[PDB]
Amino acid sequence: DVQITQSPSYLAASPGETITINCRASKSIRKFLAWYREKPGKTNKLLIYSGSTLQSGTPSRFSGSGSGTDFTLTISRLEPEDFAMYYCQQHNDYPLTFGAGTKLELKRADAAPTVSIFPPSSEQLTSGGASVVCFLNNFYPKDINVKWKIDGSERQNGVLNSWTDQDSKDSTYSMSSTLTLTKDEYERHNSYTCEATHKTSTSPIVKSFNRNEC
Amino acid sequence: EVNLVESGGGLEQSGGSLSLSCAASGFTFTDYYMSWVRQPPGKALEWLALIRNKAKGYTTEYSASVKGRFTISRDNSQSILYLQMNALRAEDSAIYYCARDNGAARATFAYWGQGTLVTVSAAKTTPPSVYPLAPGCTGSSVTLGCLVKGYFPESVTVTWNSGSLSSSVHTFPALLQSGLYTMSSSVTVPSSTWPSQTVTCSVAHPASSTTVDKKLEPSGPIST
Ligand code: NA
Ligand code: NA
Ligand SMILES: [Zn+2]
């Protein structure tokens, strides 16, 4: 009803940095904009309400401004705990409506993934299926390309990828890539390769195995 | 301190019903506005229903998306908040949270629960196949895993050696494939310790009352 556009959707920043996040309503909301943060395993917390009033307990490095259709959240000198998902919400009028969020990510040194490949298990082959699995663990930033090669030929069907959220402790990402085939399909070729291209090197990290080296 | 705990979430078919409740504590319940907000997967939080305080005589407001199907109510003596959900739709699938206002500004949410998951689907409760991920035909550290595939509805929990090398485990979120969920989990341990000592993944899927324990074995013969 009042639609709320949050931007940027994603921002990486350093501990000690100051940043600004934006929220824009499709029509005036007077001053009634609230800001929240979300973190995994924690309940949502209100930071600011009525545009610029700090919720009891919010650190003073948070400030809010705006009126009408354009607001902003500023956080000065980021603390580690400030890295989170931030939402805005208008509370001028029903139906209450939220922005889609700004992911505030902690910028750490670039790191290459550790890559591991797994053939399908006996157990899975017995059932008629064949999943080849590649883990790419502990890298940064999250952008990465994985390609799957069967007998040297790029495979672009049946790959599913999944990433973890940024790690609380080391600030890295990890992902799985899984190429799922039928048994028959799996047995008609020999070499299975997953290749990870990540900005830490112009050389892909390559992991393979031969069905018929075992 | 203030606590809100949601419950009653589960799987239903399209056209069924569900009742959610929210156990609230740590404030005078009747002094506050209480709401239900949901987060469908990949989408913005969506406010659904508000019930005001005693001062306001407990009047309600609804989102157009649940109006006439969902009804918010309060048990004031017990400090429980309810959401009765009738004529469920697959688009209703989401994590549902209960929330309380901050007192100064009545249409904000100072406290939330952790949420309860609601699935509306025609898929049937199905337990996972659990497959081991060990290296085939190495160095100082070894990565192992478990592929958990073909389950419904969420969630599953994967425990490695009764919680002991949960510092180096990675849990990959589930994705729907062929109507069913798949996820995997990995753990990284020193080569000094596996295959020398045992490593097991235990996979709980409460929906089907199933727990699978899978020992990771080294590359050995086809025989044995
Ligand atoms: Na690549
Ligand atoms: Na739907
Ligand atoms: Zn071939």
Shortest distance between the Cα of B45 and any Cα of chain A, in A, equals 6
Written as one letter, the residue type at A132 is V
B34-73 per-residue burial string, b: 16 or more CB within 10 A, e: under 16: bbbbbbeeeebbbbbbbbbbeeeebeebbbeebeeebbbb
User: Nearest bound ligand to CA B91?
Assistant: 2
> How was this one solved?
X-ray
**A101 Cα to chain B: minimum distance (Å):** 7
Bridge partner list, B116: B96
Spell out which residues of chain B touch residue A159, defining contact as CB-CB under 8 Å.
none
The interface residues of chain A toward chain B in range 13-32, judged by CB-CB distance below 8 A, are 32
Cα(A133)–Cα(B135) distance, rounded to whole angstroms?
11
> What values do phi and psi take at A3, rounded to 5?
-90, 140
d(CA A98, CA B3): 23
By the 10 Å C-beta count (0-12 exposed, 13-18 middle, 19+ buried), A94 is classed as middle
Query: A98 and B109: CB-CB below 8 Å?
Result: no
In chain A, domain spans: 1-108, 109-211
- Give the experimental resolution in Å: 2.0
CA distance B136 to B130: 18
All domains of chain B, ordered by start, with CATH?
1-123 (2.60.40.10), 124-224 (2.60.40.10)
Q: CATH for A1-108, among 3.40.50.720, 2.60.40.1930, 2.60.40.10, 1.20.1260.10?
A: 2.60.40.10
- Phi and psi for A47 in degrees, rounded to 5? -110, -50
Same fold, A1-108 and A109-211: yes
Instruction: Tell me whether A174 touches chain B (CB under 8 Å).
Output: yes
Range list of H helices, chain A: 122-126, 183-186
A–B CB contacts, 8 A cutoff, strictly below = 129
Angle at B73 between CA B69 and CA B77, to 5 degrees: 160
For chain A, give the residues followed by a break (C–N over 2.5 Å).
none
3-state secondary structure of A124: helix
* CATH number for the domain formed by residue range(s) A109-211: 2.60.40.10
Contact state of A137 with B110 under an 8 Å Cβ cutoff: no
Contact A84, A10 (CB under 8 A): no
| Chain B nearest C-alpha distance from A14 (Å) | 24
Ligand at shortest distance from the CA of B40: 2
Which residues does chain B break after (C to N > 2.5 Å)?
137
B207: helix, coil or strand?
Answer: helix
* Residue-wise DSSP of B12-73: E-TT--EEEEEEEESS-GGGS-EEEEEE-TTS--EEEEEE--TTTTT-EEE-TTTTTTEEEE
